[PDB]
Amino acid sequence: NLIYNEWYRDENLINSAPLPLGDEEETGLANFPLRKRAKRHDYFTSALPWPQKGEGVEIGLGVPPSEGGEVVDNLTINSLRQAFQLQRLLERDARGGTRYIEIIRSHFGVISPDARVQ
């Protein structure tokens, strides 16, 4: 299961296989089914559920009252560039992956050994 979670599981379509680390006796293989490998990377199988990993960055506009409106302040250029760089970060997370080793390799130039990151 640990090999499956780290090397074969798709990080965003598939839930982690259960990995109990304690002493407890199991009965039956209900936590340990035989796993399927993923299909090769192509046009469809390398698609993603969303255009970025988070909710997607939306610059607020407010809405008129009925009373009961939503009030939003004037946009500073600093707010606007922060929204762009946040979107770039969430797109890098979607494209690059979000395991801690994938974050390091995608956001920085660094090839971490697998052994030191458990």
């Binding site: 560039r81 760089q85 920085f108």
Partner: protein
């Protein structure tokens, strides 16, 4: 006894020092780092599409 109180470093500094009730060492330390870092030396605001 062979225990925590025995093996912890505990020199009797209070008797060899002339002035009572002031800290034993006064220290000045300076740390000269040469860093290579994944950032520019000065960051100018700008460059929205970039990075």
């Amino acid at each position: 006894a062979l225990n925590q109180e025995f093996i912890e470093e505990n020199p009797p500094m209070k008797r060899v020092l002339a002035v009572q009730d002031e800290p034993q060492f006064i220290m000045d330390a300076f740390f000269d780092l040469k860093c290579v870092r994944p950032m520019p030396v000065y960051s100018v605001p700008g460059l929205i599409d970039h990075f």
